[PDB]
Amino acid sequence: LASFLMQAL
Ligand SMILES: *C(=O)c1ccc(-c2ccc(C(=O)OCC)cn2)nc1
Numbered sequence: 001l002a003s004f005l006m007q008a009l
């Protein structure tokens, strides 16, 4: 999940 949200950056 972290990756799925941090893709914003
Ligand atoms: C959430 O964005 C998230 C959580 C976990 C993973 C992920 C991707 C690949 C692996 C993997 O190859 O495991 C080998 C031990 C594990 N977890 N991606 C995204």
Ligand SMILES: *NNC(=O)c1ccc(-c2ccc(C(N)=O)cn2)nc1
Residues within 6 Å of the ligand: 006, 007, 008, 009
């Ligand atoms: N918010 N994330 C980004 O903007 C982002 C763009 C591109 C990449 C990335 C990572 C790894 C590779 C590679 N190993 O070829 C290419 N591009 N990460 C983040």
Ligand SMILES: Cc1ccccc1C
Residues within 6 Å of the ligand: 003, 004, 006, 007
């Ligand atoms: C590597 C990967 C794949 C799918 C969604 C987000 C990210 C960071």
Ligand SMILES: Cc1ccccc1C
Residues within 6 Å of the ligand: 005
């Ligand atoms: C979609 C989502 C979920 C949890 C925290 C942040 C964001 C953008």
Ligand SMILES: Cc1ccccc1C
Residues within 6 Å of the ligand: 008, 009
């Ligand atoms: C991480 C984030 C959050 C909201 C707008 C833009 C960006 C890059």
